[PDB]
Amino acid sequence: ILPDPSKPSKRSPIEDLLFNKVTCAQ
Amino acid sequence: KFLPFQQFGRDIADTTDAVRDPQTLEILDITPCSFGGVSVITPGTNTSN
Numbered sequence: 001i002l003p004d005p006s007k008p009s010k011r012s013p014i015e016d017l018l019f020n021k022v023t024c025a026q
Numbered sequence: 027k028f029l030p031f032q033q034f035g036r037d038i039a040d041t042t043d044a045v046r047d048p049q050t051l052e053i054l055d056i057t058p059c060s061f062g063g064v065s066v067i068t069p070g071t072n073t074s075n
């Protein structure tokens with residue numbers, strides 16, 4: 001649940017899943 | 027990859043993005059001019075100008 005130092009983005013695995021789960025000339 | 031006999035193409039809101047020179051055959055694209063709002067950061071006008 002805490003940030004993962006190894007990843008370049010200082011996030012947590014749950015935060016990583018949250019970022020990945022939810023996601024051009026105008 | 028345009029059909030050779032065809033002439034040009036467009037996109038949303040009539041944002042046409044293709045031309046062709048009648049004398050020389052080539053394909054080209056456009057991109058509208060860079061633009062934007064200009065903001066100003068200032069402290070209190072009495073403090074400084």
Ligand SMILES: *[C@@H]1O[C@H](CO)[C@@H](O)[C@H](O)[C@H]1NC(C)=O
Nearest residue numbers: 068069070071072073074075
């Ligand atoms: C700005 O400074 C002047 C003094 O030169 C003062 O009269 C005025 O109330 C000040 N304005 C603000 C918004 O503090």
